[PDB]
Paper text:
Moreover, AASS is a unique drug target for inborn errors of metabolism such as glutaric aciduria type 1 that arise from deficiencies downstream in the lysine degradation pathway.
Alkylation of LOR by NEM paralleled the activation pattern. We were able to model the NEM, which becomes N-ethylsuccinimide upon reaction with the cysteine, in the density and refine it with restraints for the sulfur-carbon bond. Interestingly, there are no obvious other differences between the apo and NEM structures. However, Cys 414 sits at the interface of the two lobes of the LOR, suggesting it is an important location for regulating activity. Subsequently, we were able to identify biochemically that Cys 414 is a key residue in the activation of LOR. We provide evidence that AASS can be activated in vitro by alkylation of Cys 414 using NEM. This modification suggests a novel site of allosteric activation of the enzyme, although the mechanism is still unknown.
Author numbering: 24 to 110, 123 to 330, 340 to 358, 361 to 450
The structure:
Amino acid sequence: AVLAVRREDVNAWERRAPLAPKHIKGITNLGYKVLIQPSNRRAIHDKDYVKAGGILQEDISEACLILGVKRPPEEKLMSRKTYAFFSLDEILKQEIRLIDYEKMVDHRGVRVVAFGQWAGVAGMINILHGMGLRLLALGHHTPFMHIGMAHNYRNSSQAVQAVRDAGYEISLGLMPKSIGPLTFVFTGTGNVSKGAQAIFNELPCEYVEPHELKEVSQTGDLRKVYGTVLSRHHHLVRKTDAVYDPAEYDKHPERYISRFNTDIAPYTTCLINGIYWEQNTPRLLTRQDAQSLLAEGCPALPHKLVAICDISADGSIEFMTECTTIEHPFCMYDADQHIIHDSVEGSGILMCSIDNLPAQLPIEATECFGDMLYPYVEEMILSDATQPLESQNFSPVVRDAVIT
Ligand SMILES: *[C@@H]1CC(=O)N(CC)C1=O
């Protein structure tokens, strides 16, 4: 009846953990022994887990349940243990049980163990930092220059203070007037969209309805930034009669299109995309839409759309084919329909599509992930990869999450 948190080795930038010291304290209070594999890579220091009752050892063969952020590869995986991770044949010989956090879903079917809003919180900070660089490359110093990447801050609190400081400069009228008012569009309904809005709320922001973007993008107060939250009924219409039936779209999305390209996109400065996109879902923007959207000392912007940030890792933007890295976060989409990875001064739209956004705020990501995983840890400690799964007293959340 021993638990172990293994060290991450998949990536040099994987600084998260499946549990925080607060969760190790609660598990040790139940009487369970917790082993902590040493890791200079983790954002939360080893001694914080030791202060919470965790024992730090390099050998975790004593444990029955071994928790990790990503799946252990080849030799590191050993027999007669129960593992859990994100992401056959010889499983039965080695008698090991593998659990995938992604498969932990409730009766409704929505995932219970995720990273929550922190992909959106980090994405909003990154795209605000990216707009500062992109607008300066176009010849405009803005308060967005005083916002760094999400991983340059100890936590979201420190990042919020930087966003509020830059927002104060905007309220003082220090924005260049020639580029006009800035409009931000939030798509999607998940927690990542709410996390992006949480950062946006620290600016001198004003929320408007999607139909107001056309007027707001022309006459908006230059001491403010403007945002709108896009719902399905704002842009999805039937191909035949332009009617929106919410139940019909949820069953037959192939009967609908998106007027985002004509109704919203021409009046959008920055698009924060958190859309859940399936293969037969109407696309938000096509390649031809991008071609149409791109056509003295205080000059205006070449095009209204400055940048796009993908915070849900999800084909709705046709020309956002490739992904980016925390070290190289931004790329450009040229009017020649080419992807430029480092030419922020080039022609086009700034684009950001980092796949490990929560890893930029790994402390709070570890705590939020650990808060979701905590109510299922004890039943996973009592797991016996030797005994059959039917004998184990698993909740349907954990039982369905077993991939072996
Ligand atoms: C835990 C952390 C997080 O983002 N959520 C969603 C509100 C949780 O439940």
